[PDB]
Enzyme design. Structure first.
Site, mmCIF file in Angstrom:
data_model
loop_
_atom_site.group_PDB
_atom_site.id
_atom_site.type_symbol
_atom_site.label_atom_id
_atom_site.label_comp_id
_atom_site.label_asym_id
_atom_site.label_seq_id
_atom_site.Cartn_x
_atom_site.Cartn_y
_atom_site.Cartn_z
ATOM 1 N N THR A 69 0.803 -1.224 0.000
ATOM 2 C CA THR A 69 0.000 0.000 0.000
ATOM 3 C C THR A 69 0.838 1.278 0.000
ATOM 4 N N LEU A 103 3.129 1.003 9.977
ATOM 5 C CA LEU A 103 1.883 1.729 9.785
ATOM 6 C C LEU A 103 1.316 2.123 11.145
ATOM 7 N N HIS A 193 -7.678 -9.911 2.148
ATOM 8 C CA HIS A 193 -6.745 -10.599 3.022
ATOM 9 C C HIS A 193 -7.450 -11.712 3.789
ATOM 10 N N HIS A 237 -2.420 -1.897 -5.563
ATOM 11 C CA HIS A 237 -1.899 -3.207 -5.945
ATOM 12 C C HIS A 237 -3.029 -4.202 -6.148
ATOM 13 N N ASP A 584 26.811 -0.317 -14.719
ATOM 14 C CA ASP A 584 26.144 0.356 -13.616
ATOM 15 C C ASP A 584 26.605 -0.252 -12.305
ATOM 16 N N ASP A 588 22.222 2.216 -9.584
ATOM 17 C CA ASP A 588 21.190 3.234 -9.450
ATOM 18 C C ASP A 588 20.245 3.204 -10.647
ATOM 19 N N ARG A 590 21.090 4.057 -13.724
ATOM 20 C CA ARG A 590 21.524 5.022 -14.724
ATOM 21 C C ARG A 590 22.985 4.782 -15.074
ATOM 22 N N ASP A 592 26.954 5.124 -15.601
ATOM 23 C CA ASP A 592 27.973 5.635 -14.698
ATOM 24 C C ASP A 592 28.801 6.721 -15.367
HETATM 25 C C1 LIG Z 1 14.166 8.458 -10.722
HETATM 26 O O1 LIG Z 1 13.972 9.851 -10.610
HETATM 27 C C2 LIG Z 1 14.669 10.425 -9.528
HETATM 28 C C3 LIG Z 1 14.302 11.904 -9.450
HETATM 29 O O2 LIG Z 1 14.394 12.490 -10.729
HETATM 30 C C4 LIG Z 1 16.181 10.242 -9.664
HETATM 31 O O3 LIG Z 1 16.759 10.497 -8.401
HETATM 32 C C5 LIG Z 1 17.822 11.464 -8.480
HETATM 33 O O4 LIG Z 1 19.064 10.883 -8.815
HETATM 34 C C6 LIG Z 1 20.112 11.819 -8.949
HETATM 35 C C7 LIG Z 1 21.347 11.088 -9.468
HETATM 36 O O5 LIG Z 1 21.443 9.820 -8.856
HETATM 37 C C8 LIG Z 1 20.369 12.501 -7.607
HETATM 38 O O6 LIG Z 1 21.356 13.504 -7.734
HETATM 39 C C9 LIG Z 1 22.442 13.241 -6.821
HETATM 40 O O7 LIG Z 1 22.219 13.651 -5.489
HETATM 41 C C10 LIG Z 1 23.207 13.129 -4.619
HETATM 42 C C11 LIG Z 1 22.815 13.424 -3.169
HETATM 43 O O8 LIG Z 1 22.757 14.812 -2.907
HETATM 44 C C12 LIG Z 1 23.508 15.102 -1.708
HETATM 45 O O9 LIG Z 1 24.724 14.376 -1.687
HETATM 46 C C13 LIG Z 1 25.655 14.738 -0.684
HETATM 47 C C14 LIG Z 1 25.093 14.475 0.717
HETATM 48 O O10 LIG Z 1 26.057 13.814 1.507
HETATM 49 C C15 LIG Z 1 26.129 16.179 -0.888
HETATM 50 O O11 LIG Z 1 27.419 16.149 -1.460
HETATM 51 C C16 LIG Z 1 25.204 17.007 -1.782
HETATM 52 O O12 LIG Z 1 25.407 18.376 -1.463
HETATM 53 C C17 LIG Z 1 25.450 19.268 -2.606
HETATM 54 O O13 LIG Z 1 26.134 18.705 -3.711
HETATM 55 C C18 LIG Z 1 26.462 19.637 -4.728
HETATM 56 C C19 LIG Z 1 27.612 20.526 -4.266
HETATM 57 O O14 LIG Z 1 27.835 21.535 -5.226
HETATM 58 C C20 LIG Z 1 25.248 20.480 -5.117
HETATM 59 O O15 LIG Z 1 25.166 20.586 -6.521
HETATM 60 C C21 LIG Z 1 23.970 19.858 -4.565
HETATM 61 O O16 LIG Z 1 22.859 20.645 -4.936
HETATM 62 C C22 LIG Z 1 24.055 19.722 -3.043
HETATM 63 O O17 LIG Z 1 23.739 20.938 -2.399
HETATM 64 C C23 LIG Z 1 23.737 16.612 -1.597
HETATM 65 O O18 LIG Z 1 23.274 17.061 -0.343
HETATM 66 C C24 LIG Z 1 24.593 13.673 -4.983
HETATM 67 O O19 LIG Z 1 25.582 12.975 -4.261
HETATM 68 C C25 LIG Z 1 24.887 13.491 -6.467
HETATM 69 O O20 LIG Z 1 26.044 14.212 -6.839
HETATM 70 C C26 LIG Z 1 26.594 13.631 -8.040
HETATM 71 O O21 LIG Z 1 26.446 14.467 -9.169
HETATM 72 C C27 LIG Z 1 27.023 15.743 -8.986
HETATM 73 C C28 LIG Z 1 26.708 16.618 -10.195
HETATM 74 O O22 LIG Z 1 25.317 16.839 -10.271
HETATM 75 C C29 LIG Z 1 28.530 15.606 -8.785
HETATM 76 O O23 LIG Z 1 29.073 16.877 -8.507
HETATM 77 C C30 LIG Z 1 28.843 14.638 -7.643
HETATM 78 O O24 LIG Z 1 30.228 14.373 -7.593
HETATM 79 C C31 LIG Z 1 28.074 13.331 -7.819
HETATM 80 O O25 LIG Z 1 28.596 12.582 -8.896
HETATM 81 C C32 LIG Z 1 23.703 13.930 -7.322
HETATM 82 O O26 LIG Z 1 23.533 15.328 -7.228
HETATM 83 C C33 LIG Z 1 19.093 13.136 -7.064
HETATM 84 O O27 LIG Z 1 19.294 13.531 -5.726
HETATM 85 C C34 LIG Z 1 17.913 12.172 -7.130
HETATM 86 N N1 LIG Z 1 16.676 12.877 -6.846
HETATM 87 C C35 LIG Z 1 15.801 12.428 -5.945
HETATM 88 C C36 LIG Z 1 14.766 13.411 -5.482
HETATM 89 O O28 LIG Z 1 15.814 11.276 -5.502
HETATM 90 C C37 LIG Z 1 16.591 8.829 -10.078
HETATM 91 O O29 LIG Z 1 17.866 8.856 -10.684
HETATM 92 C C38 LIG Z 1 15.626 8.166 -11.052
HETATM 93 N N2 LIG Z 1 15.866 6.736 -11.035
HETATM 94 C C39 LIG Z 1 16.172 6.084 -12.152
HETATM 95 C C40 LIG Z 1 16.393 4.604 -12.032
HETATM 96 O O30 LIG Z 1 16.269 6.646 -13.242
HETATM 97 N N1 LIG Z 2 -2.515 6.752 5.475
HETATM 98 C C1 LIG Z 2 -2.705 5.453 5.709
HETATM 99 C C2 LIG Z 2 -3.363 4.597 4.706
HETATM 100 C C3 LIG Z 2 -3.563 3.168 4.983
HETATM 101 N N2 LIG Z 2 -3.099 2.655 6.230
HETATM 102 C C4 LIG Z 2 -3.312 1.243 6.504
HETATM 103 O O1 LIG Z 2 -2.676 0.485 5.496
HETATM 104 C C5 LIG Z 2 -3.419 -0.731 5.308
HETATM 105 C C6 LIG Z 2 -3.087 -1.319 3.955
HETATM 106 O O2 LIG Z 2 -1.811 -1.955 3.947
HETATM 107 P P1 LIG Z 2 -1.513 -3.185 2.975
HETATM 108 O O3 LIG Z 2 -2.414 -3.157 1.796
HETATM 109 O O4 LIG Z 2 -0.145 -2.928 2.427
HETATM 110 O O5 LIG Z 2 -1.354 -4.474 3.772
HETATM 111 C C7 LIG Z 2 -4.869 -0.328 5.493
HETATM 112 O O6 LIG Z 2 -5.598 -1.419 6.051
HETATM 113 C C8 LIG Z 2 -4.797 0.820 6.517
HETATM 114 O O7 LIG Z 2 -5.236 0.477 7.815
HETATM 115 C C9 LIG Z 2 -2.456 3.484 7.231
HETATM 116 O O8 LIG Z 2 -2.081 3.056 8.262
HETATM 117 N N3 LIG Z 2 -2.264 4.895 6.945
HETATM 118 CA CA LIG Z 3 25.072 4.483 -12.394
HETATM 119 ZN ZN LIG Z 4 -2.763 -1.894 -0.244
HETATM 120 ZN ZN LIG Z 5 -3.186 -5.273 1.948
#
Ligand SMILES: *[C@@H]1O[C@H](CO)[C@@H](O[C@@H]2O[C@H](CO)[C@@H](O[C@@H]3O[C@H](CO[C@H]4O[C@H](CO)[C@@H](O)[C@H](O[C@H]5O[C@H](CO)[C@@H](O)[C@H](O)[C@@H]5O)[C@@H]4O)[C@@H](O)[C@H](O[C@H]4O[C@H](CO)[C@@H](O)[C@H](O)[C@@H]4O)[C@@H]3O)[C@H](O)[C@H]2NC(C)=O)[C@H](O)[C@H]1NC(C)=O
Ligand SMILES: Nc1ccn([C@@H]2O[C@H](COP(=O)(O)O)[C@@H](O)[C@H]2O)c(=O)n1
Ligand SMILES: [Ca+2]
Ligand SMILES: [Zn+2]
Ligand SMILES: [Zn+2]
Ligand SMILES: *[C@@H]1O[C@H](CO)[C@@H](O)[C@H](O)[C@H]1NC(C)=O
Ligand SMILES: *[C@@H]1O[C@H](CO)[C@@H](O)[C@H](O)[C@H]1NC(C)=O
Length: 706
Positions: A69, A103, A193, A237, A584, A588, A590, A592
């Site tokens: 859920t 939960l 369930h 689901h 990769d 992640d 994506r 490298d």
């Molecule tokens: C699905 O979709 C989601 C969302 O679109 C994707 O998730 C995103 O992935 C990207 C890439 O993997 C993430 O970006 C990275 O973020 C990390 C973490 O950020 C923090 O890391 C440190 C904490 O200890 C810290 O260093 C950072 O601080 C600053 O870093 C710089 C400094 O200048 C600055 O630019 C930042 O703004 C921060 O203030 C930060 O707190 C980070 O480590 C990564 O850095 C890499 O890239 C940078 C260049 O951009 C490079 O300089 C580094 O060396 C390093 O290589 C990178 O920024 C992003 O956070 C994700 N977003 C979310 C919301 O989850 C995901 O990829 C998708 N999945 C798939 C399967 O496609």
């Molecule tokens: N905001 C929410 C939404 C659902 N729930 C709980 O999650 C349960 C569903 O979990 P599952 O389907 O994953 O087993 C619901 O029965 C409900 O009691 C919760 O605790 N908080």
């Molecule tokens: Ca990668």
């Molecule tokens: Zn459910």
């Molecule tokens: Zn359930």
């Protein structure tokens, strides 16, 4: 006449009452509403059926993994993979926080769990009010923002009061009235369930939920909003029938041990008891190898977190345990028979490609087409869909923005193809001619379009150096920075060893010589393009067509081309193939960067080698079997991301049935074409005649098991 009693009415133009500027959007969720329910019990659900027949419906909506859920409900409103938005499971644990999640727990309302950005937060930053009701993440404040109208979860609250609550909010002044709404009901998950997917209690529950939606629609009509609201009737689901005989207990292989903790279910994970003292210190590799292939037809499989099929996207989170378990349908896993709630109860959490794990999706309103049935799509695509319905700029998510344009009458966002970031250069003949030490036993535009008929893959890598090497049977995009082919495309029609030739167009590497490869080392070379093409094709024996490959993987790779590929060419009247290595190491999903690539470059046999973690392969054919891959009107894609392993422990080769276990590995590691794009930094089908939105639909597609 009630709303359910009236026939269909085309809402081409929104008919809104005064004080309304644009139709609001309500997200109605029915937990545990398996997709099969509406397929079979349509005649028992008159309200839901009318919404289906007058709106946009899809036979199956693919949820996220695991099928729980909270992860799914939160993935809907964030458009993110569970590995990225923080909510991995209903019950989980974070090592860096030394805290568990549940939960029924105080840690649930902790904002440190919820990552990403839900839609109501998105709406708030762009001055759009939102009124939610019992949606996961609505109770907690994320980024210091709470929905303008919220209610902390209380499952004792009667359903009828929830509907009326939303109906009362719809009457609020134009400045204090929300534009986005949510609704949640625990049925038919609860009845599912306790009694199973096929029971009298679920039928009574489905009918109960059906009349309740009918109550909502009648309520909308009395407010004069039945033609002024966008409704999205969704679920998290599906539901599967569990059995006592079909349950796995880890103690049978380990004993009544207390050093390990097991999060029970069909998607089991394992962490040590001494935590976080030994969370990383514990070597999971040994336990995983000790649990693999213990049974003749084992219904579970030990998986290291990066070794899971890439399609699941279930690795890059701290909260996910380094040891996971993949189970066959209708099977759950636990440590001891005491930890589990019950064995013969209705469950969910299985693979998101399973038939009964599929969810419901119905889009109704002025914005949605009437009586349109579309193909399956993931729930992460819905987030972007809502932004278009609320006029919001979407936060960075995992959904291909614009891939759901076919559901709407007038699409808001028109997607475009990704620009080529690669530094494309050319490779002429420059270095002649080294000795490879190999034993060998005895115009251009026409041949280009023949090898890449849908357009060459575009290089999204920034700013990688890539050369285009043209041959008579295939075209290969070669990397100068890695000195190996990134991809190789060729067309294989319906009916058409220790030796190698030096490609004078590429710089020579010590790993190109056959003298480098001994018969003792498990590491060898494989071809991206099969040499048995069209006598024997010699250009497939070019140095620029080989990649580092384990001997164990060559068993799968050869059978893939010698048997399966030829069979698929007969069934699909020829196939277009694009193959290449996948790197990769940070798992992640994506590609490298050059920096992390150099860190994972092993040295073997006295030479430095960057060895692939996976190998991708995309099979493309015509939807019409009368056409060859060079004249498709519409495409038929199927991609695979095969794990490059030194051994075949995952497959349980033992018993030696080669034609069986290979195909089972292929089907298991099938992936979206988008997944391949994301992990290789390539873009496919850009010169294809279909529109961008259509191509996104094609590339984000996956087949449902059973
Ligand atoms: C699905 O979709 C989601 C969302 O679109 C994707 O998730 C995103 O992935 C990207 C890439 O993997 C993430 O970006 C990275 O973020 C990390 C973490 O950020 C923090 O890391 C440190 C904490 O200890 C810290 O260093 C950072 O601080 C600053 O870093 C710089 C400094 O200048 C600055 O630019 C930042 O703004 C921060 O203030 C930060 O707190 C980070 O480590 C990564 O850095 C890499 O890239 C940078 C260049 O951009 C490079 O300089 C580094 O060396 C390093 O290589 C990178 O920024 C992003 O956070 C994700 N977003 C979310 C919301 O989850 C995901 O990829 C998708 N999945 C798939 C399967 O496609
Ligand atoms: N905001 C929410 C939404 C659902 N729930 C709980 O999650 C349960 C569903 O979990 P599952 O389907 O994953 O087993 C619901 O029965 C409900 O009691 C919760 O605790 N908080
Ligand atoms: Ca990668
Ligand atoms: Zn459910
Ligand atoms: Zn359930
Ligand atoms: C982690 O949590 C447990 C359970 O509350 C606690 O006993 C232990 O002291 C904690 N460990 C650390 C390192 O804080
Ligand atoms: C939960 O909701 C019910 C029904 O409104 C109510 O009677 C009860 O007091 C609520 N419980 C809590 C803990 O608020």
């Amino acid at each position: 006449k009630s709303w359910v009693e009236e026939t269909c009415e085309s809402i081409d133009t929104p008919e809104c009452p005064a004080e309304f500027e644009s139709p609001p959007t309500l997200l109605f969720s029915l937990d545990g509403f398996r997709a099969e329910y509406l397929h079979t019990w349509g005649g028992l659900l008159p309200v839901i059926s009318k919404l289906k027949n007058c709106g946009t419906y899809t036979k199956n909506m693919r949820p996220m993994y695991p099928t729980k859920t909270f992860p799914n409900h939160y993935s809907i409103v964030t458009g993110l993979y569970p590995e990225s938005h923080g909510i991995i499971d209903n019950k989980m644990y974070d090592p860096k926080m030394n805290a568990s999640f549940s939960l029924k727990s105080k840690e649930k309302f902790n904002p440190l769990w919820y990552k990403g950005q839900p839609i109501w937060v998105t709406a708030n930053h762009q001055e759009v009010k939102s009124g939610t009701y019992f949606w996961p993440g609505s109770d907690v404040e994320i980024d210091g923002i709470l929905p303008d109208i919220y209610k902390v979860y209380n499952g004792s609250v009667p359903f009828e009061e929830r509907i009326l609550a939303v109906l009362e909010w719809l009457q609020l002044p134009s400045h204090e009235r929300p534009h986005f709404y949510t609704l949640y009901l625990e049925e038919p998950d609860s009845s599912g369930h306790s009694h199973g997917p096929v029971s009298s209690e679920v039928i009574k529950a489905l009918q109960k939920v059906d009349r309740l939606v009918g109550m909502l629609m009648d309520g909308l009509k009395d407010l004069g909003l039945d033609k002024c609201l966008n409704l999205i009737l969704i679920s998290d689901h599906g539901m599967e029938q569990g059995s006592c005989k079909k349950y796995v207990y880890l103690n049978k292989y380990l004993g009544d041990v207390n050093n390990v903790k097991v999060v029970y279910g069909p998607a089991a994970r394992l962490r040590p008891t001494d935590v976080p003292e030994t969370y990383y210190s514990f070597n999971y590799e040994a336990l995983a190898k000790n649990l693999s292939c213990r049974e003749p037809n084992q219904h579970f499989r030990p998986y290291l977190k990066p070794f899971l099929p890439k399609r699941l996207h279930f690795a890059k989170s701290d909260r996910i345990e380094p040891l996971t378990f993949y189970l066959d349908p209708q099977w759950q896993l636990a440590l001891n028979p005491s930890e589990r709630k019950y064995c013969g109860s209705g469950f969910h959490g299985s693979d998101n490609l399973f038939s009964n794990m599929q969810a419901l999706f119905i889009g109704y309103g002025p914005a949605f087409k009437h009586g349109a049935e579309v193909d399956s799509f993931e729930n992460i695509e819905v987030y972007n869909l809502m932004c278009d319905l609320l006029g919001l700029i979407p936060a960075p998510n995992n959904g291909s923005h614009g891939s759901l344009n076919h559901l709407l009458k007038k699409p808001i966002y028109n997607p475009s193809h990704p620009k080529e970031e690669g530094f494309l250069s050319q490779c002429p003949i420059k270095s002649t001619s080294n000795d490879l030490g190999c034993t060998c036993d005895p115009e251009d535009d026409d041949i280009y379009h023949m090898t890449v008929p849908y357009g060459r893959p575009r290089i999204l890598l920034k700013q990688h150096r890539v050369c285009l090497l043209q041959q008579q049977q295939f075209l290969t995009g070669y990397s100068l920075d890695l000195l190996m082919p990134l991809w190789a495309s060729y067309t294989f029609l319906s009916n058409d060893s220790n030796c190698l030739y030096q490609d004078l167009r590429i710089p020579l590497s010590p790993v190109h010589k056959c003298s480098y490869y001994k018969s003792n080392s498990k590491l060898s070379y494989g071809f991206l393009t099969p040499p048995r093409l069209n006598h024997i094709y010699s250009e497939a024996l070019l140095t620029s067509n080989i990649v580092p490959m384990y001997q164990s993987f060559q068993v799968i790779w050869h059978y893939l081309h010698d048997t399966l590929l030829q069979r698929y060419a007969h069934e699909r009247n020829g196939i277009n193939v694009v193959s290449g290595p996948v790197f990769d190491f940070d798992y992640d999903g994506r590609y490298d960067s050059l920096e992390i690539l150099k860190q994972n470059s092993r040295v073997i046999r006295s030479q430095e080698i960057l060895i692939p973690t996976h190998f991708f392969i995309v099979l493309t054919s015509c939807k019409q079997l009368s056409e060859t891959p060079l004249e498709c009107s519409a495409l038929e894609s199927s991609a695979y991301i095969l794990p490059h392993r030194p051994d075949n422990i995952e497959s349980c080769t033992h018993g030696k049935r080669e034609s069986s276990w290979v195909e089972e590995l292929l089907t298991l590691h099938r992936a979206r074409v988008t997944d391949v794009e994301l992990i290789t930094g390539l873009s496919f089908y850009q010169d294809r005649q279909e529109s961008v939105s259509e191509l996104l639909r094609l590339k984000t597609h996956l087949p449902i098991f059973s």
